[PDB]
Design an enzyme around this catalytic site. Structure first.
Site, PDB file in Angstrom:
ATOM      1  N   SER A 167      92.006  35.827  88.338  1.00 37.04           N
ATOM      2  CA  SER A 167      91.317  36.615  87.344  1.00 37.04           C
ATOM      3  C   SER A 167      91.120  38.050  87.797  1.00 37.04           C
ATOM      4  O   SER A 167      90.480  38.303  88.807  1.00 37.04           O
ATOM      5  CB  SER A 167      89.941  36.016  87.067  1.00 37.04           C
ATOM      6  OG  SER A 167      90.094  34.670  86.608  1.00 37.04           O
ATOM      7  N   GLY A 168      91.683  38.979  87.029  1.00 37.86           N
ATOM      8  CA  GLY A 168      91.563  40.390  87.355  1.00 37.86           C
ATOM      9  C   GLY A 168      92.840  40.864  87.992  1.00 37.86           C
ATOM     10  O   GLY A 168      92.900  42.000  88.472  1.00 37.86           O
ATOM     11  N   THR A 172      96.955  39.756  81.593  1.00 34.47           N
ATOM     12  CA  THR A 172      96.869  40.386  80.273  1.00 34.47           C
ATOM     13  C   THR A 172      97.635  41.700  80.155  1.00 34.47           C
ATOM     14  O   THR A 172      98.488  41.840  79.272  1.00 34.47           O
ATOM     15  CB  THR A 172      95.412  40.688  79.940  1.00 34.47           C
ATOM     16  OG1 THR A 172      94.929  41.717  80.808  1.00 34.47           O
ATOM     17  CG2 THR A 172      94.574  39.430  80.129  1.00 34.47           C
ATOM     18  N   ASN A 207      86.056  40.853  86.033  1.00 36.55           N
ATOM     19  CA  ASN A 207      86.773  41.736  85.104  1.00 36.55           C
ATOM     20  C   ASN A 207      85.912  42.445  84.059  1.00 36.55           C
ATOM     21  O   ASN A 207      85.165  41.798  83.320  1.00 36.55           O
ATOM     22  CB  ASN A 207      87.807  40.933  84.323  1.00 36.55           C
ATOM     23  CG  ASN A 207      89.014  40.602  85.190  1.00 36.55           C
ATOM     24  OD1 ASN A 207      89.549  39.497  85.120  1.00 36.55           O
ATOM     25  ND2 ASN A 207      89.439  41.563  86.012  1.00 36.55           N
ATOM     26  N   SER A 210      87.315  40.862  80.751  1.00 34.00           N
ATOM     27  CA  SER A 210      87.740  39.488  80.932  1.00 34.00           C
ATOM     28  C   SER A 210      88.111  38.751  79.638  1.00 34.00           C
ATOM     29  O   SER A 210      87.329  38.680  78.715  1.00 34.00           O
ATOM     30  CB  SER A 210      86.625  38.681  81.585  1.00 34.00           C
ATOM     31  OG  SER A 210      86.372  39.190  82.899  1.00 34.00           O
ATOM     32  N   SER A 211      89.312  38.192  79.588  1.00 30.84           N
ATOM     33  CA  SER A 211      89.748  37.440  78.421  1.00 30.84           C
ATOM     34  C   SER A 211      89.034  36.092  78.465  1.00 30.84           C
ATOM     35  O   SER A 211      89.158  35.364  79.446  1.00 30.84           O
ATOM     36  CB  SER A 211      91.261  37.248  78.464  1.00 30.84           C
ATOM     37  OG  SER A 211      91.682  36.530  77.303  1.00 30.84           O
ATOM     38  N   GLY A 426      92.573  33.409  84.226  1.00 30.93           N
ATOM     39  CA  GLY A 426      92.972  32.507  85.294  1.00 30.93           C
ATOM     40  C   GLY A 426      91.809  31.900  86.048  1.00 30.93           C
ATOM     41  O   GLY A 426      90.685  31.875  85.545  1.00 30.93           O
ATOM     42  N   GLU A 428      88.747  31.261  88.440  1.00 32.63           N
ATOM     43  CA  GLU A 428      87.580  32.090  88.689  1.00 32.63           C
ATOM     44  C   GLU A 428      86.489  31.236  89.311  1.00 32.63           C
ATOM     45  O   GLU A 428      86.172  30.143  88.823  1.00 32.63           O
ATOM     46  CB  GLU A 428      87.076  32.687  87.379  1.00 32.63           C
ATOM     47  CG  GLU A 428      86.533  34.072  87.631  1.00 32.63           C
ATOM     48  CD  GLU A 428      85.301  33.979  88.530  1.00 32.63           C
ATOM     49  OE1 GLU A 428      85.486  34.034  89.772  1.00 32.63           O
ATOM     50  OE2 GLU A 428      84.182  33.853  87.963  1.00 32.63           O
TER      51      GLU A 428
END
Length: 772
Positions: A167-168, A172, A207, A210-211, A426, A428
């Site tokens: 994540s991050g 994306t 993030n 963050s999605s 993803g 996390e």
């Protein structure tokens, strides 16, 4: 090539390098250190660190072979002599600190997050990557996209990119650049992100954007190879962020856009005071976001609703329903010492809500404080059904929103094949992890294992199918388990799912029913360990996920999985005035969505993108080797490269093979799969340098180049032999002429000598004389 367009794209290397002195020695800060051996001693090697020039010993079997300066900042790592966690980490980190963030690892790509804008995505650059073959031009994401296009076209099959990472990392950003790319070689498509991101993204510690939902977008192509449509699929939106947000985190982006004054005209339409820190539901954690201008994002989001083709009412229906939420959480309450059922503490805010949703504020608070056979609710049973409502609305808005944006994209044009892109949320790990995370994580697992299957399990299978030659290799990369611990028949989720259907159940029968089944019967399931980060909230058990060990707190997991909104209010809204508002467990449902996604994926020729978070500080150009190295481990990079170097990259359909290599043993060819069985057999070809296959032949590396060698040779000979045949024909043709002329001359020579001697005959002389 002197092209300005290659500043942060093309690699910009000699001496001091002894292939026996220089090596890689483990490190705690850098993961691996550049060492120069000094003295052996059985197993105790004594090296010198080139950096600080310090000294130390190291087990002999812990030294790693370094690569020669020949492969500095190499574009494709499969071409390196050594592909070990220290050679890989060195190559990447080498490139990265120089602007180059893309590198091929064999067949898939590696993207290392830049944390800064780079002039590598321009239209100038896109022009140069068009129709280019991966080796022809520097490594780039365009190349990966451009190639998947060519394959779908020439190979006539669906393509697909699974862009993975933590994540991050860049999942994306890179997914968008791929679409933006494929779109450039349309306007609404690109424009669907700004609205979906506003409603399904949020600041998080990790993030700032963050999605919070899974995204699978397919891009269809027509008979001329051009974009002819597109659809979007989303998965598991964080219903929970709506009403709750851990410290240092924000609620979805919209809510903050809505209270900025980007469009003052709208303030009265939504009935909002341009202050976010005014609404409980969105001021729990953070308010602002370093590098996110809510003013301008609101404008652009508004601007994007137009381009998407949203009537003004439609896009005001959205904005109102979401501003309405900003109020559901302002409705205060009270009890009334006695029974407590509960009474209101005003009505001002509870009306604005009924107003915006086009329902009677009266009929509302009514079916909310004594849901109907009646059954009153206490003071919390209410404030919690308020949240149940907020969450459930937002989950419908988001779903309707996507259906609508697909309305605008499902052009009924003619479709051939497509190219999907998968961006799922993803891995996390936070201070406190609950059901939300298990869901995201279970999701991300899952995916990794896909790469493992298609990468190792798979590769060798095809070798067999085609019927080539080969011996198996165990890369030891399987998570079916972890996967199994969570999804299989008696798994974690299945336990929880069967625990919801019981009204009696609670956070303890669920917790006990869990150990009851997996404690000691599955090693992935382990009692909560000890803190590896401050503020580490409660943990009830730990799971060993591909990219980390996660301590999960199962408190509240029963309500989280069984949703619950007053079937009463669902009636109110069922017949509301607003036209939008008017329009199985979670686990099982999602498990199913996911299984369906996976099923859709398998039918593809996958190209993989691997994102990598450079550090835990969110700052650009800074590397944390340990972390990096660590990823280069749980992702399977190295192994992912061994087979590209190890394996049998060739492949031929017997139909096209017979046609091209029959001329190499034609005195043995009386079915395309047996003909080749013969040819390659005749040539007394080593079973090693090739393999069977059901529909295709597999030739080890180089071999095919060598077959085209023998192929020419023969083709040259044969051509000579037909020239020989032409030489021999012309010769033999003129054979009478040398035999024929030898006779035809003897005639004339002997027959003139006659007429010559006959005239020298007195008789004839005198005869000729009389004649007249």
């Amino acid at each position: 090539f002197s092209d300005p367009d290659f500043q942060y794209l093309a690699v910009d290397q000699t001496a001091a390098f002894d292939g026996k002195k220089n090596c890689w020695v483990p490190d705690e800060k850098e993961g691996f250190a550049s060492a120069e051996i000094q003295s052996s001693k059985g197993d105790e090697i004594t090296v010198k660190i080139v950096a600080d020039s310090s000294t130390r010993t190291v087990k002999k079997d812990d030294i790693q072979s370094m690569n020669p300066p020949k492969f500095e900042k190499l574009e494709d790592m499969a071409n390196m002599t050594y592909l070990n966690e220290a050679s890989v980490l060195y190559n990447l980190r080498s490139r990265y600190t120089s602007g180059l963030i893309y590198t091929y690892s064999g067949l898939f790509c590696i993207a290392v997050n830049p944390y800064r804008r780079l002039p590598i995505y321009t239209d100038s650059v896109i022009a140069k990557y068009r129709g280019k073959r991966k080796t022809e031009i520097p490594p780039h994401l365009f190349s990966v996209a451009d190639n998947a296009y060519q394959n779908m076209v020439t190979d006539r099959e669906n393509q697909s990119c699974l862009i993975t990472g933590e994540s991050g990392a860049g999942k994306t950003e890179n997914t968008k650049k791929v679409i933006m790319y494929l779109a450039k070689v349309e306007d609404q498509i690109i424009q669907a992100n700004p609205v979906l991101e506003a409603y399904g993204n949020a600041k998080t510690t990790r993030n700032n954007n963050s999605s919070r939902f899974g995204k699978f977008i397919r891009i269809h192509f027509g008979p001329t190879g051009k974009i002819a449509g597109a659809d979007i699929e989303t998965y598991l939106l964080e219903k929970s962020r709506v009403t709750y947000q851990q410290s240092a985190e924000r609620n979805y982006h919209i809510f903050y856009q809505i209270c900025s004054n980007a469009i003052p005209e709208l303030n009265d339409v939504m009935l909002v005071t341009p202050d976010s820190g005014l609404y409980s539901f969105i001021n729990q954690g953070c308010l602002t976001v370093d590098n996110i201008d809510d003013v301008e994002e609101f404008k652009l989001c508004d601007e994007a609703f137009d381009i998407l083709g949203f009537t003004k009412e439609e896009k005001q229906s959205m904005f109102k329903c979401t501003a309405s939420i900003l109020h559901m959480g302002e409705m205060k309450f009270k009890q009334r010492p006695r029974e407590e059922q509960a009474e209101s503490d005003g009505t001002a805010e509870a009306e604005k809500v009924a107003f915006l949703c086009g329902i009677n504020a009266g009929d509302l608070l009514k079916a909310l404080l004594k849901p109907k056979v009646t059954k009153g609710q206490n003071m919390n049973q209410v404030v919690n059904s308020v949240g149940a409502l907020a969450k459930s609305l937002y989950d419908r808005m988001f779903n309707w929103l996507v259906r609508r944006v697909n309305k605008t994209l499902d052009t009924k044009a003619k479709r051939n094949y497509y190219i999907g892109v998968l961006d799922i949320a993803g891995f996390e790990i936070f201070d406190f992890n609950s059901f939300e995370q298990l869901c995201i994580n279970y999701t991300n697992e899952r995916l990794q294992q896909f790469f493992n299957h298609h990468m190792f399990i798979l590769e060798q299978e095809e070798y067999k199918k085609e019927g080539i030659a080969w011996e198996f290799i165990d890369f030891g990369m399987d998570l079916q388990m972890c996967i199994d611990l969570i999804e299989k028949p008696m798994g974690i989720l299945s336990i929880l799912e069967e625990e919801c259907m019981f009204p009696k159940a609670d956070d303890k029968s669920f917790q006990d029913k869990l150990y009851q089944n997996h404690m000691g019967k599955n090693r992935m399931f382990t009692k909560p360990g000890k803190p590896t980060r401050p503020n580490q909230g409660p943990a009830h058990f730990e799971l060993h996920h591909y990219a980390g060990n996660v301590p999960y707190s199962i408190t509240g997991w029963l309500e989280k999985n069984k949703d619950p909104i007053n079937e009463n209010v669902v009636a109110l809204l069922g017949a509301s005035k607003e036209p939008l508002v008017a329009e199985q467990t979670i686990s099982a449902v999602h498990r199913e969505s996911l299984n369906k996604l996976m099923k859709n994926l398998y039918s593809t020729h996958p190209h993989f993108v691997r994102c990598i978070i450079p550090n835990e500080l969110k700052q650009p150009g800074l590397v944390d080797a340990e972390l990096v190295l660590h990823q280069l481990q749980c992702n399977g990079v190295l192994e992912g490269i061994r087979i590209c170097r190890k394996g049998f990259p060739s492949r031929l359909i017997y139909s096209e093979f017979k046609q091209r290599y029959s001329i190499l043993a034609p005195n043995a060819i009386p079915d395309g799969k047996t003909v080749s069985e013969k040819i390659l057999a005749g040539l007394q070809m080593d079973p090693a340098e090739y393999r069977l296959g059901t529909t295709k032949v597999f030739f080890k590396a180089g071999v095919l180049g060598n077959l085209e060698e023998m192929r020419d040779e023969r083709l040259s000979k044969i051509i000579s032999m037909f020239q020989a045949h032409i030489r021999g024909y012309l010769i033999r043709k003129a054979y009478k002429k040398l035999q024929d002329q030898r006779i035809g001359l003897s005639v004339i020579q002997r027959n003139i000598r006659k007429w010559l001697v006959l005239r020298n005959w007195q008789w004839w002389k005198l005869y000729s004389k009389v004649k007249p």
